[PDB]
Symmetry: C2
Subunit: 306 residues, 2 copies
């Protein structure tokens, strides 16, 4: 199975999915539009969260970075009054370095990910959406900046007026992802930000037509009129998208077969049918692995049913 | 006073010199032929050792790196079986990052040294010999490799048959070093390897002729027929130079004015006179700060006696 992952939502679901399906059969296509070179090394946050999740080292408190990691370099630089831009732990930096040394030798982002997977003892097939650079810029009132500066540097406080994913049009779907699509038929879109987390992946050239030829299931990241977390509350409207389960559904309308939204919503299931997709409800608020596992089972059943 | 520094000998002597002269008056011109980009960031080992020595953070046990530094990142990669090429501490890596972010922004190695000096609160004037890239390669029976590969990777075991300082002829003396020379009259060559620690500096185009117009004092790094530490024993003969204080003096013959070698030698003062330089002996074996101080005093006396 192929899972489109980005943000913190999907990795939480993958946390449960990896408990009901053989790891080898799990192919995670990760968003790279957040990738940034920092302190000489490439940081692929969405790629690393999945790598750490599948290697039991993810920090389940923030759902990014390594559990109880040290910050020697980060602290020393802070004493000198220098800010790396994000809290880079020492063990986490090793991943950036190992990945970047591979890239500096000529290998691709996919190559480094495959290697990191072996080093971490991961059986799942973790792959970046593309081997090409893609960056997400948020057009706010205070000017145009990178997603990082906006979400981390500004705590997402600024007001968003637009979103720009640069390079996506010029990018190419990873060769190994196209290979996976050649042997797969089920695609799961995790409950993440449709604009900045998932959008980049589906925005790649040839992806929309590729999804149309497959069974696609998606889980709503919104439980009502606002997402469980993330800057989805601002980024979505700024793109002319209603912040609701119905909005997300309409967004994937072109290729969505099955949709799964939260119980609390209790929305017109007949309305979803109008969009051309079968919808069902479940508890999408994953407060623990067990809750994630229960949502993963409902999702699997969604693929099995006809 | 200007001091040419490289290796571990000169910084040990600087440790004593900074105790008997005002630090603001010490300008250190540092070797950069050992500089390497490692794990995404530039490492200038000779520059850093001096930076750490003048900021009271040098590790006096190995005379490189920071005292009681942590190795979170280094250890993590070791567990994964990946070697960076040398033991990089977390605090030390901060220095490489701060320096590299500056170079990445478009500034020079000298510019980054000025900034790091401010951050560290150093009064001494630390300058790299040149802003241009220079790399020391060691020609062995097993093949040609970088100094680091030979000294750290192979532990200095290979049989040395040649030394190649690449880029030195294309490199230029740092403009700030030329400016410092314009105002200085006394130049000191610390007791370091004359081939790879001092050699690169005096090999820069125009440097030799520049040294002739000044009062130069050198301290022999050889006691007897071998150096106190380092691979000078292999590198010197591999360049047709006899491993002795006399060999060192002949190497600097073109500009040496005063030579200081160890007492354990008792060599013909007529021999040195023939080379055109006043010579005297002293205990050049610096086993402690006090011994370095004692040797630094004799060195200052050498400049005073003229
Ligand atoms: O909100 C934050 N998110 C962080 N994230 C999450 C995204 O953004 C990280 C992801 C990585 O893979 C490595 C480091 C970080 C650091 C931070 C951080 O400091 N603050
Ligand atoms: O002989 C060694 N010298 C080391 N050196 C000294 C030179 O070579 C360092 C200098 C630095 O500035 C930073 C790290 C190192 C690490 C090593 C080492 O691991 N072994």
């Amino acid at each position: 199975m192929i899972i489109f992952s980005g943000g913190t939502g999907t990795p939480k679901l993958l946390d449960g999915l990896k408990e009901i399906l053989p790891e080898e059969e799990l192919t995670v296509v990760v968003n790279t539009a957040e990738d940034l070179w920092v302190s000489g090394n490439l940081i692929s946050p969405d790629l690393d969260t999945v790598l750490y999740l599948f290697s039991d080292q993810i920090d389940r408190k923030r759902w990014w970075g390594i559990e109880n990691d040290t910050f020697g370099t980060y602290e020393r630089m802070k004493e000198l009054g220098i800010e790396e831009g994000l809290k880079l732990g020492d063990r986490d930096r090793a991943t950036h370095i190992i990945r970047s040394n591979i890239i500096r030798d000529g290998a691709s982002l996919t190559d480094s990910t495959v290697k990191l997977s072996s080093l971490f003892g991961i059986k799942a097939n973790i792959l970046p959406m593309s081997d090409d650079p893609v960056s997400t810029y948020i057009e706010t009132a205070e000017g145009i900046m990178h997603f990082q500066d906006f979400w981390i540097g500004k705590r997402g406080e600024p007001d968003v007026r637009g979103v720009d994913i640069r390079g996506v049009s010029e990018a190419s779907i990873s060769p190994k992802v196209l290979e996976a699509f050649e042997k797969e038929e089920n695609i799961l879109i995790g409950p993440s930000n449709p604009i900045t987390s998932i959008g980049p992946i589906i925005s790649l050239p040839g992806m929309r037509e590729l999804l149309k030829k497959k069974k696609v299931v998606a889980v709503s990241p919104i439980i009502g009129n606002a997402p469980v977390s993330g800057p989805a509350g601002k980024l979505m409207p700024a793109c002319g998208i209603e912040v609701s389960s119905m909005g997300v559904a309409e967004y994937y309308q072109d290729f969505l077969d099955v949709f799964v939204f939260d119980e609390r919503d209790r929305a017109d299931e007949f309305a979803f049918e109008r969009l051309g997709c079968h919808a069902s409800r479940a508890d999408t608020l994953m407060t623990s692995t067990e809750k994630s596992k229960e949502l993963a089972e409902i999702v699997v059943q969604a693929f099995l049913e006809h």
